[PDB]
Ligand binder design. Sequence first.
Ligand SMILES: Cn1nnc2cc(CO)ccc21
Length: 118
Amino acid sequence: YDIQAWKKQCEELLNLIFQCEDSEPFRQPVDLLEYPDYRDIIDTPMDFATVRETLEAGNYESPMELCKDVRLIFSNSKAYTPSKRSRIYSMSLRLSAFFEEHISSVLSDYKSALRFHK
Ligand SMILES: Cn1nnc2cc(CO)ccc21
């Protein structure tokens, strides 16, 4: 029933994600010199460095808010890819499966802790 425990659990999951080779295209903002049409397709850019900095600044109130931004990384890859067989999109699907498998207990424990508090 620790209402604060999610934050260190999200720090440790981001460290696992940074060690995975599948995260490399997603660690920093998409390079607009490499992809000059990116902002004609994608309204809200997001990357794992941005998510870690927001967490470390004390600018997430809950793990649900962190989860919305990580899901935006994956939806941006699905919207920008020219093919469902592309290399980088293929990497996004494996990393999304890994993230969802690990975030589920973080979300459940936080929501349970908050119900006990209230
Ligand atoms: C950043 N991102 N996410 N998905 C992408 C797909 C491509 C091309 O297959 C290029 C860049 C991508």
